[PDB]
């Protein structure tokens, strides 16, 4: 199961909220926003229209990694393209397929693992609100692509994941085989290390080799700092098995300070071997 | 155009300069050092004699990355191939051509985005040097790499761009459509992650993909430590327009202290839409 | 020295963790000499390896291999319960796959590369007591028809250290002029670390070369890495820049000011090594 060609004119609305404890969140619908935010996907030459309503008493903006957007959409202050409380805008990203240039050089294409994420809480640079949770995955797929059948974003929010409370994960579920994409994005002052137990993947786009050909470092673990952004797919148990697959941030303090979750990876039946929480 | 073969015998003068404040610059003129020092452009297989001479008080020296040089100008106090007070040196840089070795191997050319540096100023790892102001960019190209419009070079030193005091830029200037080539060192004590708003590249040697089969990601954020050295080309605005396009460390405090400039970028009349300094 | 075979074979080893002076603790394949790196680990891709493991510490203590193939049963972990306790032994399996062809059309990669096994359970489960005493080491993946080197060294930034030494100790490696030298580069604990090497080169890829002209990889000389990261390269000593002593050291400057700097010591066939004075 492979991506198509894009090309389609999308429209959602969006939607910046307070949420318990300080935090700040996008959502699609109102009273439903979430940290981190929507996950946004879409196919080289696609359009999106994002129709943002912000809900809060604080001006906020959006800005995104990437796609190819016009200043009016760049979501800063330098551009006058936040939104002021109560205030609305549609925020418009687009997308384009790679091509020979007339000149012979090669345009790359939009396709990529990215990111979008307030500009303008706190400070010109958006501290605030990526800190209170103001930040989400977008994916941008190439014609031919390979589909997942689950997709997890795995946020590194200064010393938090997803912004949650320390030692609480976020664990995810899978059956031995199953195609699973990581979205990996960093955020706020600290540089971190990704790994995964039990899995590894290409250090390329879309995190899979091409070919024989394709030279990449196959890698299980990866330093990362703030706006940073990768994806891979994995197949779940590949050569190893059910279990228990512990993933953290590898510098041993922010592990020892709770920056782990797990991957439980089940057999057929539900069951996950060795696992007794 | 394109770069051409090289090979050429090239000569140049040098010379390592206080500056006002207790800076230290590296210039090809007397009276005429900068920080970043002078920019270097060869064609693999050229051969660099620096004329070196140092102008200050203190031992001083030339150390540069990549490119092929005997251990006589290594640049550092160990072998004596520093400079003293007052001294005079030359400094030979070679450079080489890629091709197939006699074991079989592919021997990688000398192309890239390189840098050179003071390494023997407070310490012997040139730690005041580097923090003074040593430090310059080189660029050495192979035979058919696109030739940009003009190059700028943006330093993250410790947490300031180009030893400015925080909050001043740099800015460049540019029209839609020209081919731009920013060079992107980092030195001193700190990791960083520059990101440039509304543009992008591949995280390759030259910044842009070879083709269709090339599998490097695609990115505008990198993370990137002290005496790393990557550089890229864009076409500015492609896709996105005129504007003052942000670029930045988003490591959130260094963003917030000042480490930010702006790629104003205008449209054929000169005008820069919703910008007014 | 030839190109590396096509793995399939299943092979044997013992392994000891064992306390060191000074509070130290490593991995040793003879009882009695441990070392900080631990062993040096080489398979082809295919290969099998059965590590007889025996803890003679009077702590609990584990290996947990990062890259190859293991189940469940050989991650080394408290939470899967395959540590071992003191004075016990286990044995630990580590599989490994060449490249190929998937059901679903997709390619598989191989577990060629450079990696590295390490304890997770001294001083709290993420191992941090145990990595930071000198349990780690290196393990070298081969995909058929790799390039086999003249010598192997391995680096290791473990905090402010290299190799768990005293400051401004090292350590230094000798070569000749043309020969093909490989380094394993590993960095553990709670800092980033840029390596740099004077005089040399190499490609940022799996081999650390060129597959060929058309292979784009960045060629560097200095890399940004943090705590459990592993790659390497082979270099040809001297080329294009001849015998001399080569530093190599992090660049962070104040790691490099308080002496995180070794050599590489590259002499002409006749043993000469141009200015070196120490
Ligand atoms: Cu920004
Ligand atoms: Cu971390
Ligand atoms: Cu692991
Ligand atoms: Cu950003
Ligand atoms: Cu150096
Ligand atoms: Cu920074
Ligand atoms: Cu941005
Ligand atoms: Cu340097
Ligand atoms: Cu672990
Ligand atoms: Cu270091
Ligand atoms: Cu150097
Ligand atoms: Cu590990």
Known sequence: ????????????????????????????????????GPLIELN???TLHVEFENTMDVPVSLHVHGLD??????????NKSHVEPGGTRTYTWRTHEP?????????AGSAGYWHYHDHVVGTEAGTGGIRNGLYGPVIVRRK???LPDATHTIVFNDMTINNRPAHTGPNFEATVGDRVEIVMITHGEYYHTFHMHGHHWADNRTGMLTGPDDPSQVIDNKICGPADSFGFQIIAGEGVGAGAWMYHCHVQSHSDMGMVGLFLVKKPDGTIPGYDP
């Open 1 to 36: 199961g492979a991506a198509p060609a894009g090309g389609e004119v999308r429209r959602v609305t969006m939607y910046a909220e307070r949420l318990a404890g300080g935090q700040m969140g996008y959502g699609l619908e109102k009273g439903k926003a979430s940290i981190p």
């Open 44 to 46: 080289e030459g696609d």
């Open 69 to 78: 957007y016009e200043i009016s959409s760049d979501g800063t202050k330098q």
């Open 99 to 107: 091509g020979r240039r007339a000149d012979g050089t090669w345009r």
């Open 144 to 146: 031919g692509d390979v």
